[PDB]
Every structure is written in structure tokens, then in C-alpha cells.
Design an enzyme around this catalytic site. Structure first.
Site, PDB file in Angstrom:
ATOM      1  N   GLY A   1      16.970 -70.081-110.057  1.00 37.26           N
ATOM      2  CA  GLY A   1      17.220 -70.933-111.201  1.00 37.26           C
ATOM      3  C   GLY A   1      17.731 -70.135-112.377  1.00 37.26           C
ATOM      4  O   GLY A   1      17.832 -68.908-112.289  1.00 37.26           O
ATOM      5  N   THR A   2      17.981 -70.785-113.508  1.00 38.82           N
ATOM      6  CA  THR A   2      18.468 -70.071-114.676  1.00 38.82           C
ATOM      7  C   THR A   2      17.297 -69.717-115.575  1.00 38.82           C
ATOM      8  O   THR A   2      16.186 -70.245-115.434  1.00 38.82           O
ATOM      9  CB  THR A   2      19.487 -70.876-115.490  1.00 38.82           C
ATOM     10  N   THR A   3      17.555 -68.787-116.483  1.00 39.26           N
ATOM     11  CA  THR A   3      16.544 -68.396-117.438  1.00 39.26           C
ATOM     12  C   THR A   3      16.004 -69.622-118.151  1.00 39.26           C
ATOM     13  O   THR A   3      16.757 -70.522-118.528  1.00 39.26           O
ATOM     14  CB  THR A   3      17.135 -67.432-118.462  1.00 39.26           C
TER      15      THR A   3
ATOM     16  N   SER B   1      12.704 -74.721-113.706  1.00 36.81           N
ATOM     17  CA  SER B   1      13.731 -73.941-113.043  1.00 36.81           C
ATOM     18  C   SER B   1      13.437 -73.872-111.559  1.00 36.81           C
ATOM     19  O   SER B   1      12.296 -74.035-111.115  1.00 36.81           O
ATOM     20  CB  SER B   1      13.840 -72.515-113.619  1.00 36.81           C
TER      21      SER B   1
END
Lengths: 72, 231, 242, 236, 242, 249
Positions: free
Chosen positions: E28-30, E73
Site C-alpha cells: 500500500g502507500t504511505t 492501506s
């Protein structure tokens, strides 16, 4: 880089071909430039048109067509 | 079948391979292109026949007089989802006396995919939908994945040779955003968009299927000799 | 068959490997607990450790308040810890509701044990990987400790420990009740039992402690409380002045 | 339980229907021939075992209505289920629609019955094949039908099922005539007895015959009767 | 072949299923959650994958009831299901007790729901990390929820690919302010550390989303940052990293 | 046999193809079907089936594959007929329901589409509706009909849940040898009798027995007479008049 070896006509645009090929690896691409001069020999020429590379896209890729689809 | 089998498994890669298998349903599907300006949305779908004695199989399903969806992939799955969407649109007209918003219906559709991805004995649907509509917040084009991802885009494609359409839209992007109140132009631009995604499958006047929605125009499907104005 | 141990079914040895594996997942937090009986109290200590500073220390816990007189100390993973805590609180409410007096610790031990048995008899239940210690002060049985485990077995105790290195603690308790010649410490204030317990823990684990390295729960009569760090510090200071 | 006991096969089949057909091939053999005014079902019974009570044991031909008989080949245990369902439907028809069943309708019902345990989940097909024969009421056309565990139903002029049915079928092509049945009941009976003696062999005690005549007359001929008929065939 | 289901154990204490879910989350992204004195500040990195997208037209931060922000996320559709479930539970509490659900109570609920998906062969454990928090009347709180059904308190929590960078930076931020900072001042900091957590991810371009629930500026409701404030945070980070 | 397959343990499972395997299998069970040929003109639709005898003891004039849905819709089944047994009942019910609700003739397309909804219910329990099948049907229909709003229609209904409108279509084992000929011989200037004899033509070539009225059966749907099954005598007459024009070449 391949087509420099062989003789082409002066109506060729290397972006047209590159647009119409997406996710082609260098071995495939080598396999279009050779494939164009097959078609040129069959027509019977001594120069390789810009229409031929386009037909080598279909004749030789990696896969024979999308498949039989019956409701895909 | 090691980790590849079942919609319950992981996947030391963090993945699940059922999802990618279902996205192949998009790949073996026929190309469809959607693009929207700020006053009109247009879906241009490439129908496709089985043979010459056969007719073409529809690709655009009217969901509502301001809302439409077009399938890419397995028809039988498209059928489950389209019924569902019409159901809740008529619901919203009934209970809230309100058109169903696009942004919202994407989320409803999301959960409906998620839960056949949850339970054992389910499957991911093998159909990706492009859903256009015109509501109180304007034009909208949503992209729906077998993953269950809903995204809002100016113009997108799915099918086979979807890439060649995206590049076209990448050049002509800022053209069709500035054209508003002239639906004809948007339709022509979509015809040209899907010309880039032919396999020498020439545009005929019964192979091309158009559907539009406007500020001032209900959802319409053009087919037959209604599409000749643009071909 | 090839499956004897993805489902709860006996082996050719006449056994349940699965439940074994449950016992092999109780030592992953590597927390240790020590629980002893006073004369009118019950005292339990457990480790607290945070692997990082960016956790808030207060929320990190293993002493869970089930009833107002029954404390529950968990050895094993915290997800299963929470599921067990919820189970038990439900049953406590329901006992009070149907019988008109708060749940006895004994009854809770057994109720939870039977639920455990059910998780290892249904082919699609996963057993809990937690050992639970129930500490109470009863008025019919006095201070008591009951230990249940993933098998659904439970037993009473005079004192008991849990954790990966809990053999050390067993030695300590054994020698202590050897000298005393009686099954409980004779001490009439809960404070000094906290003190004794921490002494045996320092001796057994071989490592000194601090207020933020401990967690203390005390069951007195008609109540259960947990001490905060401030009060734990005071116990540690009074240990040195014995 | 809702898991399939029926898996689709890439062959264009379902394995269990094939296996069912095999089960039906191992079963005892039944012959059906209809005259011009009768129907004749002949069946092999294995009375080779000794000290068998045969008085109290049901024959392999079951009356399902006062004018509709069912004979079977395949799993003996399984068949009784079909038999109960069918008797039930027979009464239902009279209840709601009034006038005993017709052979065709009942045949259709049985067809759906065996079909359903194919298409449903949690169930395997029946490996049983039936010969349904009889008369319609107010009518005197013998109607002879055959149902098979595929859930497919057929009309036949004459038919045979069970063990080594092929031999007798070849006999029947050559001793029964599509154009002309044997008109007397007795001759029909003896034609089927002569058929049975192909495979059944080993005396005339393993042969059983039920004869049905319209107006609801179902009668089964005892061993003595058969002995006489057989011996006549033997002498000739 | 102990990697096949969730209800299996292994003699290593492992249940390979659940560990594998973490690798879905690593994809996932930050996403950061800054615990401040006044409330909480969430921020999410929203990758701009193509020039065909409509910007600031997709939210990865969704609110539950009105005072608990939720940002997740891993798998976006799966986390979406989880948030829907939590809203059902929130509304249930609100009907039954006439008060917006406390944040610890919320934590109990979601933790139980995810813990549930490891006890049955029938289901797959969710592959999402959630960060949720806000202001209730017993203060601001922050929780990070594992795909394992584990959670703890946090003064700063992070997940995603640039979690490496973010955790380190948060360590510093608690070393700059051991008594904390303002939620007003934290807008700029979320901008900062997302930007720093995009050098591991510098294949692309992204859009910054920030939202916050603080008592002093939004009156305890979960609102989004916009306008001149949002763009100022952007510029702040931009100048720091150049 | 035992063709290499990675997935036969689910009934809804993928398939590095990107499509269902069981559906694929289903379409390979229509190639064992007895040939059904169907010619659609603008003057009626003609459905011809080979009744398929297997024994001269078998009575083949009491078996047929022509199955009436209603006066204005007829249907031909090819493939596995035990499955069609169920589907045709369902369709009859649907038609009667429409006439109950609306006192109106049902569209040929709407009906075809309803039965396609029926075909797609295989599963263990998934989407919002209960699966009461476990394996897909292996039978395909040629639904012919006439409605007053689009005229004569001929639809091919698949066990997939997909329907294509055809102007002529053959299914069964001899379907390819028939369809090659359809592509060449068909046009939109046919008349009813010309199409009728065309059916008997292409049925001849996929005939594995011999053409006569005892293993071959015709039926029509016409607007003002409805669905009519041609009796055997009439069929015989047509077969002989084919033999007259066959000896005129």
C-alpha cells in the site's frame, strides 16, 4: 538499430511503429524488422516500405490472436 | 495450484491470483472507450459478431434515463451487476425522491465484489464496467475493475488494445475538456479514439455502438443508422 | 489420512497434534506471570515490555478486568487475548442475570474450559492459543487461582507461573512453600504480598525491574484493582528496605 | 451439506451418469414386449440361492397403479425410493385432476425424478433403469415406455434392459416384428419366454412373467404356468 | 502445507496465512497518523497514476461516525469493506446508548471483527492495516490495527512502503517535542514526512491528502484540510526537501 | 480423456485462460447433439430436427425434439435433453406468467433472455440469489418465434447465458458441415417452401442414417397459424419432391 543494417525507404516514421507496438520486447522488435523484409521479398521489391513493418506486427508477435472468444 | 487455486488463499507474494485471472476477462474482451467533457459523457463501444449469419452482441445497457453502463468481459456476469445497479437506482428514486449518484453507486458495487472475494465458494466477477452518468454534480465516468476498484477519470478504456486508446486520449486530453455544449465533437473524438484500437475490424454502422448523456439530453443509445452521422 | 492435523482428529498415536501446536504458540510474546495467594488477597504480576518508544505504554496490557472480583491474566498472542476477554465478559453478565449473584471464579474457569473443548471438537474452529489465569478472592473458597489452557483442561493452584522461562519460577515457589509448610503466605496486607512476589520474580528471572517494566494486579475482597506505575515504584523501594 | 456429488466432465458428460449406466448393466435383465391388446413384462429372478422364501418377497415387478406396472434393473435398494414417489404422484393426480394417471404422464414424472438427483447438489444420481408399461384409462392401446438413469425417457415397440440385454435385443429384432405383434396373449407370452431362455438358462424357475390386460387387470403367472409354457417351447 | 488455511497452526507458532497478509499491506502507500495534544492528524499519499485522472476526486480517508477518522492501506476494496462494517457497528452503539461511540470501544469492535476471520476455514483474513482515531470526551486517541487483529496505543503510527522513513521521522518528532505539538502545527509535519516517504517510491507523482480531527480547530469533528491551508502545507514540505 | 486441467475442483474458479472452464466444457457437449437445423426467413421460421433412431425396435414417431413453448413460440433442443427437460418447463411457465400479467404475447427475445438467466445459476452459494444448480446445463436451444413488433426471430440460446440472434443456425454434431453451407446458400429473398426444402437439403448431408419421415421431423412457426408441427405424411411428400429436383441436375 536493426533497420539501419537493411535498406529502407525514406517514408518511414519510427514513432508511428513505436506507438502501435505496446509491451513488445527487444526480441519481438528484432522480429518485426526481419519480418518486414520477408513481406518485401514476397511482393518482390528491393527496398522495404513502411507498410511492411506494420504487417510484421500481426504475422509475428508472441501469441496467435486474442483467441476464440464466445462471450469474452 | 499451489497458491493459485482458491479465492481464500495467500500467496507469499501478498497477492491473490484469482484477481489477475479475472482481469484476463478484460483482456479477452472487446475494446470499449469512454470519455467525458463537463457537459456530456460519451461511451463508444465496439460490438462484435460471432459470424456473418449472427448479429452483433449488445455492449451498452441502459441503467437509467441519466445513467448507463457498458460491459467488457463475460456477458453473464455483466448481467448480475446491471440488475443490481438498476435496483438501487429505482430505490433511490423511491425512498429519497432522488437520482442515484454515480460516485456512490461505485462504492455499492465495490462491496458487492468484495464479498464474493471474501467467502469460500465465491468468485470474482469477470466483467469490467464503464459507468457514465450526468447528475447534480455534472458528468461522471467511472472505471470498475474485477478487483472492485472504482476510479474517476476524464477518459479511459478497457478491453484488448486498451493502451492504444489511452495514448490517444493523452494527446487529445485538453481538447475535449474545452468542448462543451457541442456533443457532436465529443462523439467524433471517441470514434477517432477507438480507431486506434482496431485489429482491422473496420467501423461499420452496425459494429459501432454509441451512447450519450448530456446536461439537456437523457441517456440515449445510438445504433443502426443513427451512428452514420459520425461514421 | 493425509489430514489429521489440519482438522481436529486423532492420529495413529491416538492424539491431537493440532492442540499441541496451540500450546506452541503461547510463548510468542514471551511474557511471564507469577501469581501467589496471600491470606486474604491474591497477587499477580506480569511483565510489561514495549519494543519501541512510539507506543503508548498505558495501553499495552495483559491484565484484563473481567468481573469486579475476577482478574484475568493472559499468556499468548494479544488477538486471542482479546477474543477470550470478550467471551468471558459476556458469560459474567449472563450469570449475574440468570442467578442473581455475581459469577464465581470457579464457574468461570469451567465455562471457559467447556467453550475451549468445543473449539477442539468442531472441525472448523481454531483453538485459542492463550493460557488464562483467573485470580479471585472468593468468600466461600477464599483466595483462589484457576488455570485453564488451550486444551480445555483446568486445575487449581496454590501458586503458579507461566511463560517460556517459568520453570525458574517453579523452583522458587517450590522452595518457598517447602520452608513455610503451608499452602499460602501468611500476610495480612496485600502490599507485602506484592513485595514478596516481585522478590521471587527478580530472583527467578535474574533481572531487576522498573515501574515501566512491571504490571501488577491485585484481587482484594469484593474488588479487583490494578496499580499504576507510581504505586509500583513504591513497592520496589520498600523491597530494598526489607 | 450442499457440496456437489456431481462434477462436470470435460468429455461432454458427467462421470456419475456413466458410472450409473454401468451399475444398471450389472443388474438383472428385464424384457418388455407389447402385443396388440396386452403388455408382457418378463423378468429374471435369481432363485439360484436355496432356502429362499419367495412367497413373502416382492417380485421385481411392482404395480404402481391399478393399470401401470414398473419393472427395474440396477440397484435394488435404490429403486424402492422411486417406487414410493411414483405411487404418491399417482394418488395426487386423482386428487387434483381426477381420472387415474396416463402412462405418459407418470413416465414423465419418473423421468424428472431421476433427473433431479443428477442436477441437484448433495445427491448422486440413481443407478436404476425402469420399464414402465400399461394402459391409459378409457383406452386399450398398450403403451410401453423405458426410462433410464440419465433422466431421459423413451417410447419403445419392444425393449430390454439389464445384464446381457444386447443378445436378447438382437433376438428381438429377428423374432418380433415392428409391423405385427403376436396377437394372442399366449403367443406373446411364449415369445417372451423363448427370449428369456437365451440368457436366463438353467431351468424354468428363474423366469417370472407378469401380464397386464386393460380394464385394470394385472396378474402375475405362477411357476406352474411358466413350467407348462416353457416345456412347450422346449419341445418345439 | 500449513500455509493453506488460517485455522491451521504450525509447530513454530506460525499461521502462515496471516503473516502473508502483511505482505499485502506492504504493497500500500504511505499513510501516517500523528497523535497531537489537541487531536489527530491523518495524511495519505494518493498516487497519480495517469494524466487521465480527475485530481482530488477520490478519498482514501473516510470518516466513521463523525469523530473517528479511518485511513487504511493494503487492499483498497478490502479495507473499504472493513470501514463499512465499522460504520454499522458505530450506528448500533449510537442507537443503543445515545452517545457517539468512544474510540476504545470502536477499537474493540473492529479488532474482534478482524480476529474473527482466522477462526473459520470459510473466510480469508483481511489484508489491510487501518489507522483510526479522533477526539472523544475522554480525549484524543490513536490506534493502528493489524491484519492479525492486533492493536496498541500509539503516539505516532505509520504504514505503507515508506513506513521505514516515516517511523524514523516520527521518532525525531517526539524527540523535538516530548510534551507534544499542536494539531495546527502538525499539518505541515504530515506534509513533510509523506514527502520524505516518497523517495522510496520515486517512480511516480502523487497528491497529498490531509485530514484532521482536533478539538481546538474543528470542534471535535473529523474534517478535511483544504484550500490555502492545504496548499501551504504542500509548499512547506516542498521547500524542505529542496 | 483426462485432458490437462489445473482446475476441476471448483465450479466457479479461474483458469489462467481468463474464462470459466465448466462453461467451456458445456459448449463441447453440443457437438454430440443430434443435428438441429433452423432457417429463419421473413415469411416464417422452419425448425428441422433429426429424431435419431438407435434401433428398429425403437419407436421413433413417439419421440421428438420439437417442443412447443406456446402458440407463437416454438423451440428445438440439442445436446443433453434431460437438462432441457427442466429448462423448457421453466420457459413455458414464464410465457404463461407474462400473459397473466399483461394479457400479451411475450417477445421472443425476452423469453430467450429469461432462460439465459436460468442457465447461469450454477454455484455453491454466491451472489445475492441462491444457487440451486451445481453444474451448468449442457444443452442448447434454437428458439424460433414470431412477434408483431420485430417479425420472425430465430435465437440461439447457449448454456453460457448468452444469446445470439441468427438468420439461420445449425447445432449438433454436423453443425460445421451445415454452417459452411448456410453461409453460402442463405439470402433474404427466400420463401417459405424454398427454405423448407433447404432445410431438408442440409439435413440430408448431415444425415447418418438415411432421409425419410421416420428419423426426420419438420415444424414451422407462422404468424397467422401459429406453431404447427408437420405430421409425417406431409414430411414424406416434401422429401420426395426434393428427390425430384435432385434428379433434375
Amino acid at each position: 538499430i536493426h533497420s539501419r543494417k537493411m535498406t529502407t525507404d525514406d517514408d518511414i516514421n519510427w514513432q508511428e511503429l513505436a506507438r502501435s507496438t505496446d509491451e513488445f520486447n527487444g526480441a519481438q522488435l528484432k522480429a518485426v524488422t526481419v519480418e518486414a523484409g520477408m513481406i518485401a521479398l514476397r511482393n518482390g521489391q528491393s527496398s522495404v516500405k513502411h507498410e511492411d513493418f506494420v504487417e510484421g506486427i500481426s504475422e509475428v508477435q508472441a501469441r496467435k490472436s486474442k483467441s476464440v472468444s464466445f462471450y469474452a | 495450484n499451489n497458491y493459485d487455486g482458491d479465492t481464500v488463499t495467500f500467496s507469499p507474494t501478498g497477492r491473490l491470483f484469482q484477481v489477475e485471472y479475472a482481469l484476463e476477462a478484460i483482456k479477452q474482451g472487446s475494446v470499449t472507450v469512454g470519455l467525458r467533457s463537463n457537459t456530456h459523457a460519451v461511451l463508444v463501444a465496439l460490438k462484435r459478431n460471432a459470424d456473418e449469419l449472427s448479429s452483433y452482441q449488445k455492449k451498452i445497457i441502459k441503467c437509467d434515463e441519466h445513467m448507463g453502463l457498458s460491459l467488457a468481459g463475460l456477458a453473464p456476469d455483466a448481467r448480475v451487476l446491471s440488475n443490481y445497479l438498476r435496483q438501487q437506482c429505482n430505490y433511490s428514486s423511491l425512498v429519497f425522491n432522488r437520482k442515484l449518484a454515480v460516485e456512490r453507486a461505485g462504492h455499492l458495487l465495490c462491496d458487492k465484489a468484495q464479498k464474493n472475494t471474501q467467502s469460500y465458494g465465491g468468485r470474482p466477477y469477470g466483467v469490467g464496467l464503464l459507468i457514465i452518468g450526468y447528475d447534480k454534480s455534472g458528468a461522471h465516468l467511472l472505471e470498475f475493475q474485477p478487483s472492485g476498484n472504482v476510479t474517476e477519470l476524464y477518459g479511459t478504456a478497457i478491453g484488448a488494445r486498451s493502451q492504444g486508446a489511452k495514448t490517444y486520449l493523452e494527446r487529445t486530453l485538453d481538447t475535449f475538456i474545452k468542448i462543451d455544449g457541442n456533443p457532436d465533437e465529443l462523439i467524433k473524438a471517441g470514434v477517432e479514439a477507438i480507431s486506434q484500437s482496431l485489429r482491422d475490424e473496420s467501423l461499420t454502422v452496425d459494429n459501432l455502438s454509441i451512447a450519450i448523456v448530456g446536461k439537456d439530453t437523457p441517456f440515449t443509445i445510438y445504433d443502426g443508422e443513427a451512428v452514420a452521422k459520425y461514421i | 489420512a493425509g489430514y489429521d492435523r489440519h482438522i481436529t482428529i486423532f492420529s495413529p498415536e491416538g492424539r491431537l497434534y493440532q492442540v499441541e501446536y496451540a500450546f506452541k504458540a503461547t510463548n510468542q510474546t514471551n511474557i511471564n506471570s507469577l501469581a501467589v495467594r496471600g491470606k486474604d488477597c491474591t497477587v499477580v504480576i506480569s511483565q510489561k515490555k514495549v519494543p519501541d518508544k512510539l507506543l503508548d505504554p498505558t495501553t499495552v496490557s495483559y491484565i484484563f478486568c473481567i468481573s469486579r472480583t475476577i482478574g484475568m491474566v493472559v499468556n499468548g498472542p494479544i488477538p486471542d487475548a482479546r477474543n477470550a476477554a470478550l467471551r468471558a465478559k459476556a458469560e459474567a453478565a449472563e450469570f449475574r442475570y440468570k442467578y442473581g449473584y455475581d459469577m464465581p471464579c470457579d464457574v468461570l474457569a469451567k465455562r471457559m474450559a467447556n467453550l475451549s473443548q468445543i473449539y477442539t471438537q468442531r472441525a472448523y474452529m481454531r483453538p485459542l492459543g492463550v493460557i488464562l489465569t483467573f485470580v479471585s478472592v472468593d468468600e466461600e473458597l477464599g483466595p483462589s487461582i484457576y488455570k485453564t489452557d488451550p486444551a480445555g483442561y483446568y486445575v487449581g493452584y496454590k501458586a503458579t507461573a507461566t511463560g517460556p522461562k517459568q520453570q525458574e519460577i517453579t523452583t522458587n515457589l517450590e522452595n518457598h512453600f517447602k520452608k513455610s509448610k503451608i499452602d499460602h503466605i501468611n500476610e495480612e496486607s496485600w502490599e507485602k504480598v506484592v513485595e514478596f512476589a516481585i522478590t521471587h520474580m527478580i530472583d527467578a528471572l535474574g533481572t531487576e525491574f522498573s515501574k515501566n517494566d512491571l504490571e501488577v494486579g491485585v484481587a482484594t475482597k469484593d474488588k479487583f484493582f490494578t496499580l499504576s506505575a507510581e504505586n509500583i515504584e513504591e513497592r520496589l523501594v520498600a523491597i530494598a528496605e526489607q | 451439506y450442499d457440496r456437489a456429488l456431481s462434477i462436470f466432465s470435460p468429455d461432454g458428460h458427467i462421470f456419475q451418469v456413466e458410472y450409473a449406466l454401468e451399475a444398471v448393466k450389472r443388474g438383472t435383465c428385464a424384457v418388455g414386449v407389447k402385443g396388440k391388446n396386452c403388455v408382457v413384462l418378463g423378468c429374471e429372478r435369481r432363485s439360484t440361492l436355496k432356502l429362499q422364501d419367495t412367497r413373502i418377497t416382492p417380485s421385481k415387478v411392482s404395480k404402481i397403479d391399478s393399470h401401470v406396472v414398473l419393472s427395474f434393473s440396477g440397484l435394488n435398494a435404490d429403486s424402492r425410493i422411486l417406487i414410493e414417489k411414483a405411487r404418491v404422484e399417482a394418488q395426487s393426480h386423482r386428487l387434483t385432476l381426477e381420472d387415474p394417471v396416463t402412462v405418459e404422464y407418470l413416465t414423465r414424472y419418473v423421468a424428472g425424478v431421476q433427473q433431479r438427483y443428477t442436477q441437484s447438489g448433495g445427491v448422486r444420481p440413481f443407478g436404476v433403469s425402469t420399464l414402465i408399461a400399461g394402459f391409459d384409462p378409457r383406452d386399450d392401446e398398450p403403451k410401453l415406455y423405458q426410462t433410464e438413469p440419465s433422466g431421459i425417457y423413451s417410447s419403445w415397440s419392444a425393449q430390454t434392459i439389464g445384464r446381457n440385454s444386447k443378445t436378447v435385443r438382437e433376438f428381438l429384432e429377428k423374432n418380433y416384428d415392428r409391423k405385427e405383434p403376436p396377437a394372442t396373449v399366449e403367443e406373446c407370452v411364449k415369445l417372451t419366454v423363448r427370449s428369456l431362455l437365451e440368457v436366463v438358462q438353467t431351468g424354468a424357475k428363474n423366469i417370472e412373467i407378469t401380464v397386464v390386460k386393460p380394464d385394470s387387470d394385472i396378474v402375475a403367472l405362477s411357476s406352474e404356468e411358466i413350467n407348462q409354457y416353457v416345456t412347450q417351447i422346449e419341445q418345439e | 502445507g500449513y500455509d493453506l488455511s488460517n485455522s491451521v497452526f504450525s509447530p513454530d507458532g506460525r499461521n502462515f496465512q496471516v503473516e502473508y497478509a502483511v505482505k499485502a499491506v506492504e504493497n500500500g502507500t504511505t499513510s501516517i497518523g500523528i497523535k497531537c495534544n489537541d487531536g489527530v492528524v491523518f495524511a495519505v499519499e494518493k498516487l497519480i497514476t495517469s494524466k487521465l485522472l480527475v485530481p482530488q476526486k477520490n478519498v482514501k480517508i473516510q470518516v466513521v461516525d463523525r469523530h473517528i477518522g479511518c485511513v487504511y492501506s493494503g487492499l483498497i476494496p478490502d479495507g473499504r469493506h472493513l470501514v463499512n462494517r465499522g460504520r454499522e457497528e458505530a450506528a448500533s452503539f449510537k442507537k443503543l446508548y445515545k452517545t457517539p461511540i468512544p474510540i476504545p470501544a470502536f477499537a474493540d469492535r473492529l479488532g474482534q471483527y478482524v480476529q474473527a476471520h482466522t477462526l473459520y476455514n470459510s473466510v480469508r483474513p483481511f489484508g489491510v492495516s487501518t489507522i483510526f482515531g479522533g477526539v472523544d470526551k475522554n480525549g484524543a486517541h490513536l490506534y493502528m490495527l493489524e491484519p492479525s487483529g492486533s492493536y496498541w496505543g500509539y503516539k505516532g503510527a505509520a504504514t505503507g512502503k515508506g513506513r521505514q522513513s516515516a517511523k524514523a521521522e516520527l521518532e525525531k518528532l517526539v524527540d523535538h517535542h516530548p510534551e507534544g505539538l499542536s494539531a495546527r502545527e502538525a499539518v505541515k509535519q504530515a506534509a513533510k514526512i509523506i514527502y520524505l516517504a516518497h523517495e522510496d517510491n520515486k517512480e511516480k507523482d502523487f497528491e497529498l491528502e490531509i485530514s484532521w480531527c482536533s478539538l481546538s480547530e474543528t470542534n471535535g469533528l473529523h474534517k478535511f484540510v483544504k484550500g490555502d491551508l492545504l496548499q501551504e502545507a504542500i509548499d512547506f514540505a516542498q521547500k524542505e526537501i529542496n | 480423456f483426462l485432458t490437462r486441467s489445473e482446475y476441476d475442483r471448483g465450479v466457479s474458479t479461474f483458469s489462467p485462460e481468463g474464462r470459466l472452464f465448466q462453461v467451456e466444457y458445456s459448449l463441447e457437449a453440443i457437438k454430440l447433439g443430434s443435428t438441429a437445423i433452423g432457417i429463419a426467413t421473413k415469411e416464417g421460421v422452419v425448425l428441422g430436427v433429426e429424431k435419431r433412431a438407435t434401433s428398429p425396435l425403437l419407436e421413433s414417431d413417439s419421440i421428438e425434439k420439437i417442443v412447443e413453448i406456446d402458440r407463437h413460440i416454438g423451440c428445438a433442443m440439442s445436446g443433453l435433453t434431460a437438462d432441457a427437460r427442466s429448462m423448457i418447463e421453466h420457459a413455458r411457465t414464464a410465457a404463461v406468467t407474462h400473459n397473466l400479467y399483461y394479457d400479451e404475447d411475450i417477445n421472443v427475445e425476452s423469453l430467450t433472455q429469461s432462460v439465459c438467466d436460468l442457465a447461469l445459476r450454477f454455484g455453491e452459494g454466491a451472489s445475492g440469489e441462491e444457487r440451486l444448480m451445481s453444474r451448468p446445463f449442457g444443452v442448447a436451444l434454437l428458439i424460433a418465434g414470431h412477434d408483431a413488433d420485430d417479425g420472425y426471430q430465430l435465437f440461439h440460446a447457449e448454456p453460457s447465458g448468452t444469446f445470439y440472434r441468427y438468420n439461420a443456425k445449425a447445432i449438433g454434431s454436423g453443425s460445421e458441415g451445415a454452417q459452411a453451407e448456410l453461409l453460402n446458400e442463405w439470402h433474404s429473398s427466400l420463401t417459405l417452401k424454398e427454405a423448407e426444402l433447404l432445410v431438408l437439403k442440409i439435413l440430408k448431408q448431415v444425415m447418418e442414417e438415411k432421409l425419410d419421415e421416420n428419423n426426420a421431423q419438420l415444424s414451422c412457426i407462422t404468424k397467422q397459424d401459429g406453431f404447427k408441427i408437420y405430421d409425417n405424411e406431409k414430411t414424406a411428400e416434401l422429401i420426395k419432391e426434393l428427390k425430384e429436383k435432385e434428379a433434375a441436375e
